[PDB]
């Protein structure tokens, strides 16, 4: 996932309302820009600051790739990049030049969105380095992290399978059950949901039985595991949704023994809201714990 | 959602630990049998009935349409080569732990079971054909035989299957349909899953989950009122037509097993095991005013999704 940050001083308003951004291809005089090329290297999920009338009105998640779209008809008024862009309006609205002691060191030498006194620079769609961009983040505060761990970095993941399974459902080679099942697994059916059932028998964390209450998770994602272990019914958890949610998106995760790990960035008003208590939630046999150690190293949220 | 009866005689544990169902499709002159052609009319999520020794031993779940695959284990007399293609369908076995012995219940069965294509005789002795039609009075009290365990199958499980066809179904006609609005598109798209202009515009008039008070963008899903798939394109986008919820809320809502009142009121269906309030710490009672504009919607989903009868 990558950060980027936007100056629309003068264009906020418009852009905001019809959830997008705009910039010319090219240069005037017909040469490739730096900065517009920036356009056709933003991919969905990517954190786009808006820097608007000096504040940073929203932090938000690209939802497109560039795509080549008419300039926005304005009032009383040739084709350019478009990005369709999920405005998230922060209580916090920061002015950057403020901190800019604290910013400083963090600017990179070429291509900053800020001069070294703090004034904003005056190109559109600037790359924000992953040094600078936490430092950004720190200001605005935790609504801004809310934003991002869980959300807008979940982006490229769920990008990255849904391709896997394209690759699988046109696939004129694989064999047709095969296929199929291996399809299913991905949403927790077939197979493989039958075969975690002579497994797991409830939700660990909540104790539900109930089958129409509880998603059929993989422990190593369904993306990442190779053809056998997508099928496994040692692969995966009986979970109630808003723990499946934890647990794929790894604000938790599993000690062998049983014992229930958190992420630096879960909030904790998480848990004490859905009366989730810490703890041992089991022991995970053998089987399990391979996938769960893959899950503990690759999936859980750790700096 | 239909329902069907297969009848796997001795070979239950091939079938079940295979995860399928296979039928004959013809006989040698091209014509199909009743029975034959049942396999060709079974669509994913369809309920089957898995009745094996006189007993039904799983409540299981379609997950394809029949599709062209050979024989898995060979015929008891070695035949001919044209009857090794059949028809294979993929079937989501669930075990249930009481199982029922049909014949035992005949006398309360019969006056359920069809004039024709039956799969028990009047006395409660199986046929020998191997996929049934159940319809849906028979099945009913087939489930009630069951009990809860079949119950858990089939109401906002095997049920929500032929909902989700459809919305994907109407995702891929949006986005393969060249008269559309290439931005309109990509919105329409994003919508179904709470992303894009349809979450922007939810946040404008929503702020939390309103069941469990959680105000985390990172913890919350936007959910539509009105379903995305039977909405269409101005409903589809607009902010009213949405409520941010926590994931359990939101499986719980989408599914019609809670709906709310105007003043926000929750209501609980029958089909809600009352017992998941308690295990997530969720509590009945009043969650406060929808605006007029989410008042045209909630009703569409107490009408609608909402389970009720
Ligand atoms: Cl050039
Ligand atoms: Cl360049
Ligand atoms: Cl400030
Ligand atoms: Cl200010
Ligand atoms: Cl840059
Ligand atoms: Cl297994
Ligand atoms: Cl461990
Ligand atoms: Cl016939
Ligand atoms: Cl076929
Ligand atoms: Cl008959
Ligand atoms: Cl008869
Ligand atoms: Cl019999």
Same mark, same amino acid.
């Given at each position: 996932? &990558? ?15 019809? #959830? ?35 504040? /940073?009105?929203?932090?938000? /998640? ?13 009032? =009383? ?6 990005? @369709? ?24 030498? *070429?291509?900053?969105?800020? !001069?070294? &006194? ?9 790359? %924000? ?6 430092? %950004?983040?720190?200001? /605005? =505060?935790?609504?801004?992290?809310? %934003? /991002?761990?869980?959300?807008? @970095? ?20 694989? +064999?047709?059950?095969? *296929? ?24 660990? %964390?909540? #104790? ?17 595991? &190779? ?28 000690? +062998? ?31 399990? !714990? ?7 190293? &690759? ?5």
């Amino acid at each position: 996932m &990558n950060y980027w940050w936007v100056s629309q001083k003068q264009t906020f308003k418009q852009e905001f309302e019809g #959830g997008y951004m705009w910039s010319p291809k090219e240069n005037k005089n017909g040469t490739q820009s730096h900065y517009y090329n920036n356009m056709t290297l933003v991919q969905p999920g990517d954190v786009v600051f808006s820097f608007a009338n000096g504040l /940073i009105l929203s932090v938000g /998640i690209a939802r497109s790739h560039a795509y080549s779209y008419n300039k926005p008809t304005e009032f =009383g008024v040739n084709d350019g990049w478009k990005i @369709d862009l999920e405005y998230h309006l922060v209580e916090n609205k920061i002015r950057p030049k403020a901190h800019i002691d604290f910013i400083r060191p963090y600017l990179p030498q *070429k291509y900053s969105p800020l !001069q070294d &006194n703090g004034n904003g620079n005056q190109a559109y769609l600037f790359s %924000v380095p992953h040094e600078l961009a936490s430092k %950004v983040v720190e200001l /605005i =505060g935790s609504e801004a992290e809310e %934003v /991002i761990f869980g959300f807008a @970095d979940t982006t490229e993941i769920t990008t990255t399978a849904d391709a896997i399974e394209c690759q699988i459902s046109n696939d004129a080679s694989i +064999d047709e059950t095969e *296929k199929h099942q291996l399809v299913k697994s991905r949403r927790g059916q077939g197979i493989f949901r039958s075969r975690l059932e002579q497994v797991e028998s409830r939700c660990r %964390v909540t #104790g539900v039985q109930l089958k129409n209450h509880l998603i059929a998770s993989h422990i190593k994602p369904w993306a990442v595991s &190779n053809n056998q272990e997508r099928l496994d019914g040692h692969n995966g958890l009986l979970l109630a949704p808003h723990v499946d949610h934890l647990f794929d998106k790894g604000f938790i995760s599993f000690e +062998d023994n049983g014992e229930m790990i958190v992420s630096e960035k879960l909030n904790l008003d998480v848990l004490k809201a859905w009366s989730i208590s810490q703890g041992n939630y089991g022991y995970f046999s053998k089987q399990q !714990q391979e996938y769960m150690c893959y899950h503990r190293e &690759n999936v859980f949220k750790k700096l």
